[PDB]
Every structure is written in structure tokens, then in C-alpha cells.
RNA sequence: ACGAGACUCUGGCAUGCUAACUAGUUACGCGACCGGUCGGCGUAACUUCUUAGAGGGACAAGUGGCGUUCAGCCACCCGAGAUUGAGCAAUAACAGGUCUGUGAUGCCCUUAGAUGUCCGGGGCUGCACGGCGCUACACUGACUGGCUCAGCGUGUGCCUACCCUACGCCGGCAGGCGCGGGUAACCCGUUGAACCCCAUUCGUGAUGGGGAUCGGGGAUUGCAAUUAUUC
């Protein structure tokens, strides 16, 4: 079997891109094929709430946005190198799900 | 065959697939001559056929622009025609022909090819719309 | 008053559709047919139907300010 | 001897097929055209009396413009943006039952195709049959 | 060359006033095969002041905001003004448009007095650019005054709009308002 | 077309009201058993010619659609266009005829008055039986 | 009374089945995305949870 | 020195993403037909739309005029771009609002169907478009002979049963039954966000610009629908 999908996600795009470059460079340094970083659409969680803690005042709202950036990367490689690369002490703020399909 | 010029107006999804043959544009299964709006026909058919019918027999183009709205695929078809012709005559004829066909396609359209980033604008709290509020103060 | 109208196609709707209307410099049957005090919309419909005998397919109606044929 | 479907006018193809079947009159006159609402979103349904052939060809074009389309966009293309009643009404059911009973009679005439896997696709044999129908309606009414 | 079919020509426009060379742009490279090709004059630093007459007709007719929704309608009414005036006059529609708007319209149109004025107006020598443009505006608003909200059959309403705008029949309301404006202009004289 | 005699302007066909000045989907609707979708379904099931015009109509054509209005159960369509559907006085969708005897003809309204039904009280006035929140309400029922 | 009269019908779903997970307040709760706070507590903690004012 | 600006997010701009099974695809293996169903294994170069998803530049290598020729302003002749909209928002103030958001807190009460359980019924609803969201006396407007469509963002069991729903049947339908998909560009879904020729089809327009709304296959996953999710 040579079908492995790794899901990368984070709120911060800097860490996401750095860890994606880490994974791609780790895959390509050793003789191995790897797909490009599929870039899934960003999810914009929107919540609007009145600023005031009471009923008085002009109706001014707060629009809190929360951006979730997620990527999927394919891998045709033995599971050993995948497990070694996954345990590379990734940067904080990034959630990773390595799936062996 | 790669020319890499496309045709894109507004946000319509378009494809310009090039391989030698006649230049035809398919819109909802309706080719270039018989068009979907059925009311802007002359404004799109005038530039090509009055000069020649075999004029488009150079390189066939799959143009399947799934455009909704008449201002969307109309003038997108002519964008595609001009862009495909200019790129084909650019890469695969010579520079002098480039100059003359660019001159005729520029007297076709001086400078309106590419626009600024704008669309329908956002809505603000305190009113029903983008720039509007609740009951009036006279 | 309760003006007398005829619901369907009429001889007046058929009247002078090719006698003097297309023999004027301004080829527009609207007002001239309106002078008969008979519905001009169906006069236009009859004129379009007689123009579309079957030689050339004319099924489009378009807007009110619509062109007519040239037959002078 | 026809031509491929890529350069065939799809609307002209369906209209030529419908006109040929109307002039032939081979099948009975369908009377379920407007006995029903024909879906939730029609105040006054179609009254073609060839809504059978016309809407079957429209479903066939829906099939072929992208083989493998989920059912429901059929009334997104043909159906409008509903304005039902005092309340605002959204995208939901149509009149499915009479449609299925009519399809149970249409089956066998090679007009709208229901496959064994459910859904739709290019169907090479079906594609040959539809291309032949297009070729034989190439000499049909209109375009003359 | 480029023309209209094998029966009509578009190179029959010569006025030679040597005054339409500062605002009406025909000088160097402003030519178009296209009546309208999605202009972006808004984003430009007021580069919309060299606008031709056909686009004025295109953009100066709608009542309120009850036409916008698809510029399809704008380009279609440009095309059908082309064709309908061609049918009316049997020659170039734009040429006869200019011919039938110049011979009438604003000789000294509405413009105020001094620093602020609303009581009366001033008989103002109307600039050729603004006279032509506002005469096309007169024709457009008269078309949406007569062709629209008409009590008669509408396929000659452009003929009667031409009659009201040039010959001077007492049918159009805009033409009698302009008659009052002309009465003020003569009050200046 | 018109012939040099009396056009079908004002006649007593079924004691209904119609004048030959408004066009289709309005002339047929003038009779309370013909119009809109029901007219469509009748014209389908009876296999009628599209070209026929009501300008010089024949009494039989309107009568036949009215008979279908009386008995639409066989056709598997809504027996609509009836204020009497599934209401007292008809064992099965029946047709009551004649005018000037409205109280007897529409005794349904008399039954609603004798039971003093607010629903029945709605008829005779233009207003909502539900009655929405106090606002532009009540104005419904202007004589 | 303690367990004999009550609890004889489905009533586990009302507004009293919820409260702010910070202050046990039942007014102005936020159910969206499941963080389950009131308006003001969420406004207080939005920076920490991950909601930042950009719009 | 603070504010303003700069700054951040956001908008009809990219022929590099040594980029993608959701999106078509240079040379395979499908293939009637005047190098394509290789998007129905999967092109290792792709990329044009899509991912507005990551890296970019271009109001002055400009012109004319006004201005002290400065700061700037008004129009345009190698030319995609020549005021997008919001966020943040100073010093000093208010006896402005909130102790009924608060495990953020100063100053308190005492003794019986205690504001917390039990209230079939019910609180503004005892209300007449001179406080948000509604009627165009009309070819700019019609019911699919026209859509290969232009287009925010939610959605299930960790406390906790209560989510989004495709498809068949009861069906010509609210509502009910059944296996099914969905932790989500993967399913709802190509979200039914207008029908442009507009195949009932407009002459002096009470009469498509209401139909001043209660009768009808039959009327709810929630005790209570009586001025109210019934459809």
C-alpha cells in the first residue's frame, strides 16, 4: 500500500507554511516522490455580538472572525519514513492528522 | 499546443483548449453564430465574418465558458476570440504580423481588457444595506 | 363608455396591411393602423403572420420599439 | 450519416427530436401534463402536450452535459427561483410520484435512461443511440 | 475596412466645426468597433469627460433606478436604437440623430445667476459639447416620457419623440418645461 | 373573424358577468368554474384545439367545462373553484343553479350565520380569520 | 413531590437546559460553534480562544 | 510625545505556484465524428477559470495647465491598475448605561403556599400602513419554446436524547415510514440568489400592479398553538 494522506491545519498561516515546507523537504530530501501541497479553502468562522453588556447605547457590533487554514498532502512511501517525519517536533499551533489509507 | 492567454470576464468559468482546426465557441451547446441571448448577436458576429469565414480555421479552440448572465458570456466570447487570435499570431507567425494584428485588435479595443478589484460591497450594522440606515432624521 | 371591441382577429385588423402602409417613406404600421380605432397589437400580429408565410423564419417579437420590414 | 455530439446544437437536437415525434404522432397524446402541479413551485404548470418529449429531452441534455449528475439540479436548470405564497419558500421537493409513474411507461423507448447502478453516465451504447437519434433529427423540422 | 453589412456605411459623419476636438475625442486612438466594451471610467482620475454621444444616449435615459440589473438591457437598447432609427430614417441612425437634435434643443439652457439663483435662470451660451449631450439627454428623457406611459400604440413613439424634440408639438411635458426655460432665456434678451 | 352582425358583446349564457374587452385567462375566469390551471387540465383531458377563440363563443363549450367542474372526481384532479367542496348540502360535488335566490343558493352562508361561525363571518368582509397583531389590522373588512 | 409529580413528561429541552459555561448565566448564550458562552464572557475571552477582530 | 497617516483585513489584476483524486488535461488503451468519453485505472510536465488557497508589482524610466512653480490641485496622447469598504482609533469628560453577564466586588434583610417546584388560562395582543423590513395607472414588465448558470455560510452525540439531509413509498401533496450519505471543497449540492426570444398571452388600462384570505387529499419530531411554526 502506498496511499497516505496527511492533513495539516492551523489558524496561523506562517506556521502552516513552515510545517508544510518541512514535510515537503523531508519527503524530497530522501529519494521519494511526493505530491504538491493541496491547498483547501480557508474556513472563516464569523460571530457577531453587541459590544455593550447591557441595553443602552448605539447598536454597535463586534464581528469576530476566525480563519482555519487546512492542507492535504499525498504520500506514496513506506510507513516507517512517514512515522519518522511525523515525529519531528512540529511547530506549535498546528494540528496534524496522519492517515494511512 | 499552448498559447496561455485564456478569456475571462467578470467571474465566469472559462476554458480555452487549443488544437488545430476551425475556431468555434460553444455556449450552452449553442455555437458562436447561434448564441444564447439571441439579442446581442450582431455585436459579436461583426468582427470576424466580414473579413473571412475561413479566418478561424487556423487552430480549433474548445471554448466552453459556463457563463451565466448575458454580459458574462457575451463579450467574453469576443475576449476569447481576440486573445486566441493575438496569441496564436504572436507565438506562431512572426513579429511583424504580431504588430499588425495587434494594431487591428487594439483599434478594436483601446484599453479595457483588465479591471480593478471591485464587486458588490459589504453590509454594515445599523442599517438594512451597505450605505443605508433606519428611520430618517429630517 | 363601454367601447365596442372585438376579441379576436378581424377584417379591420387585416385592413390595409399591404395597400398603403408599406408604400410610405416611414414604414411603421402602428399609428396609421391605430387611426382605424381597432386594436393595433393584433394588427401587428396579423402583419407579422402574413410576413412569416414560411420562406423566412420570423418568430421573434422583441420589445415595443421593434423594427418592421422594408417593402417599398 | 450524422456528426458527433460536440458540434451538434444540443437545444436544436432536442427541439428537432421533439418536432419529429410530434409530427409523427406515433405515441398517444399524454394527458398527465397538467393534471398535477408538476412540482411544488408551479402555480400554472407547462401546457406543451409534448412536455413528455420536451422535458425528457431536457433531462437527457442534463444527463449528457455532465454524465454523473446528482438529481435535484434538474429543477435548478429547468426550474426557476420559486416565490410561493405569503411565506418565503426555498429549494425542496417537486412532484416526484407522477414523474416516476410516467417514467415507468417511458422506459423501453430509449428516451430517458435509468441505469443499474443508479444515476447517469456517458453510456457508450446509449451514447451511440443518442448520436444516431441526433443524426436522424439532423434532417428534421426547423433549420431550413 | 469595417462597415455595416453590404448596404450601410458609417463614414458619413463630418460636421467640421473645429470645436468638437477638445471634449469629443476622435483625435488619436479613441476609436472602437464596439458601441460599448465595459468601461472602467469610474476608477480613472475623471478620465470619463471625453465620452462620445452614443454612450451618453446609452447612460442618460433610465427613469429612477428601475432599469439596472443587467447591462444586457443597455447594450440591447443601444442596438435597437441603432436599428429603429435606421428604420425610421432610412440612413445612418446616428447621423440623423445629430441632424434632428442640433436643429433644436438647448439654444440657451437652464443655468443659474451669479453665486446663487433659483428665482429665474440665465440665457447661457451652451457649449457645443454640453449642448449636444443635453440635447441627447432631452431626446432620451422624451423617449422615456412618450414611448413610456403612452396612450397610443408604441411602434412610432420614436417618430413622435423626434417630432416633439425638434418640430415642437404640444405633446411632451419635457418640451413644455423647456418652453418655459426658453421663455426665461428670452426674458434675458 | 368579425362578420357584419352582432358581436358577442353582452349576452346571457349562464347568468355570469363578462364583457368582450379583456383577453384570455380573464374571459374564461369570468365564469367561476373555468380558468387558470383547471382550464389547462380541461383543455388537456378533452383534447381541445388551441386556436379556438372566445370572441364568438358557443354555449356548449362553456357548459361542458362546467359539467367537468361538477364532476372532477374521475379525472383525479383537485375539485377546486368550488366554495362548496366537502361542505354541507352536497352528498357528492353537486351543482346548484340560478340567481336571485342567493340566500337559498348559498345557504352555506346561512348555515354559517345560524351557527354564527367567525369563519363564516369572514365571508361578506375582506379580512383575515386569524387576525394579526394589533397594527394595520381591522382595516380588513372595509364595507 | 420530590420524585412523584415532576418528571412525567419531556421537558429536558427548554432554555433552562442551558447556561453560560463560565458564569452559569442563562441569558444571551452563544450556541454557534459550540463554545457555549454568553455575549460578554465571549467578548472577554475571544482573544484567548482564537477569535480576532479583523472585519 | 499621543492622535491623523503609515498599519491590518478586504475587494470586476497576474501566464511563476518544478500545484491539486473535488476542476479540464500534450504525446497512453477506449472513441461514430468535420488529436478529444486518459474528469468514467491514474499524466509523474499541467492550471486557464477553482482553490482570493501560498510567494507580486506598475503614479510618476509620464504629459498639459493652475499654484510663490513649493506644498499641492484639475484634465490626459509608450500605458491592467489613477478616492473599495471596514478594523484599530488620542487628551480631557458624563454623577450617560450596566450591581437583573459574572466565583468582579463595597454597604443588607430574619420567621410562612420566599423572588428558586407546582400558574388548565393568560402577561405588551384592551389598537385606524400624516418605529426596519411593503403598492410603480406600465414593452424598463409576462407561466421552463433559453439556463454547458453569475453566489455568504451552517450541519450528528465528549457532558446530552435534541444536526444537515439526498432517495423510494404512503402520494396528484403538509405530515408519516424505510434502508443511505455527511465531523464536511468528499453528503445535502452543479444550494431552485432573474427566466433575456419570454409557444394561458396587453387598448383608451374599475379587471396580473391586491386578487380589502378560510372552503376544500388531510391539518405538528414539543405538556400549552384561544392574536398563532398549523400547511
CSV table of C-alpha atoms in Angstrom, one decimal, chain A residues 17-94:
chain,number,residue,atom,x,y,z
A,17,UNK,CA,3.5,27.1,5.5
A,18,UNK,CA,6.7,26.4,7.5
A,19,UNK,CA,5.5,22.9,8.6
A,20,UNK,CA,4.3,22.2,5.0
A,21,UNK,CA,7.8,23.1,3.7
A,22,UNK,CA,9.2,20.9,6.5
A,23,UNK,CA,7.2,17.9,5.3
A,24,UNK,CA,7.8,18.5,1.6
A,25,UNK,CA,11.6,18.9,2.2
A,26,UNK,CA,11.7,15.9,4.4
A,27,UNK,CA,9.9,13.8,1.7
A,28,UNK,CA,12.1,15.1,-1.2
A,29,UNK,CA,15.5,15.0,0.5
A,30,UNK,CA,15.5,11.2,0.5
A,31,UNK,CA,14.8,9.6,-2.9
A,32,UNK,CA,11.0,9.7,-2.9
A,33,UNK,CA,8.0,11.1,-4.8
A,34,UNK,CA,5.5,13.5,-3.2
A,35,UNK,CA,2.5,15.5,-4.4
A,36,UNK,CA,2.2,19.2,-4.1
A,37,UNK,CA,0.6,20.9,-1.1
A,38,UNK,CA,-3.1,20.7,-2.0
A,39,UNK,CA,-4.5,24.0,-0.6
A,40,UNK,CA,-8.0,23.6,0.7
A,41,UNK,CA,-10.3,26.6,1.1
A,42,UNK,CA,-9.9,28.6,4.3
A,43,UNK,CA,-12.9,28.4,6.6
A,44,UNK,CA,-14.0,31.8,8.1
A,45,UNK,CA,-15.9,31.3,11.3
A,46,UNK,CA,-17.9,34.5,11.8
A,47,UNK,CA,-19.6,35.6,15.0
A,48,UNK,CA,-21.2,39.0,15.6
A,49,UNK,CA,-22.2,40.2,19.0
A,50,UNK,CA,-23.2,43.5,20.5
A,51,UNK,CA,-20.3,45.3,22.2
A,52,UNK,CA,-22.3,46.6,25.1
A,53,UNK,CA,-23.0,44.4,28.2
A,54,UNK,CA,-26.5,46.0,28.6
A,55,UNK,CA,-29.2,47.5,26.5
A,56,UNK,CA,-28.1,51.1,26.5
A,57,UNK,CA,-26.3,52.9,23.7
A,58,UNK,CA,-26.0,52.9,19.9
A,59,UNK,CA,-26.2,49.5,18.4
A,60,UNK,CA,-22.5,48.8,17.7
A,61,UNK,CA,-21.5,45.2,16.9
A,62,UNK,CA,-18.3,43.2,17.0
A,63,UNK,CA,-17.5,40.9,14.1
A,64,UNK,CA,-15.0,38.3,15.4
A,65,UNK,CA,-13.5,36.3,12.5
A,66,UNK,CA,-11.6,33.1,12.9
A,67,UNK,CA,-9.6,31.7,9.9
A,68,UNK,CA,-8.9,28.0,9.7
A,69,UNK,CA,-6.3,27.0,7.0
A,70,UNK,CA,-6.1,23.4,6.1
A,71,UNK,CA,-4.0,21.5,3.6
A,72,UNK,CA,-3.9,17.8,2.4
A,73,UNK,CA,-0.7,16.1,1.2
A,74,UNK,CA,-0.4,12.8,-0.5
A,75,UNK,CA,2.4,10.3,0.1
A,76,UNK,CA,3.5,7.1,-1.7
A,77,UNK,CA,6.1,5.8,0.7
A,78,UNK,CA,6.7,3.1,3.3
A,79,UNK,CA,5.1,3.9,6.6
A,80,UNK,CA,8.4,3.9,8.5
A,81,UNK,CA,9.7,7.1,6.9
A,82,UNK,CA,6.3,8.7,7.3
A,83,UNK,CA,6.3,7.9,11.1
A,84,UNK,CA,9.9,9.3,11.4
A,85,UNK,CA,8.9,12.5,9.6
A,86,UNK,CA,5.7,13.0,11.6
A,87,UNK,CA,7.7,12.9,14.9
A,88,UNK,CA,10.0,15.8,14.0
A,89,UNK,CA,8.7,18.1,16.8
A,90,UNK,CA,6.4,20.3,14.7
A,91,UNK,CA,6.0,23.9,15.5
A,92,UNK,CA,3.2,24.9,17.9
A,93,UNK,CA,-0.2,26.0,16.9
A,94,UNK,CA,-0.5,23.3,14.2
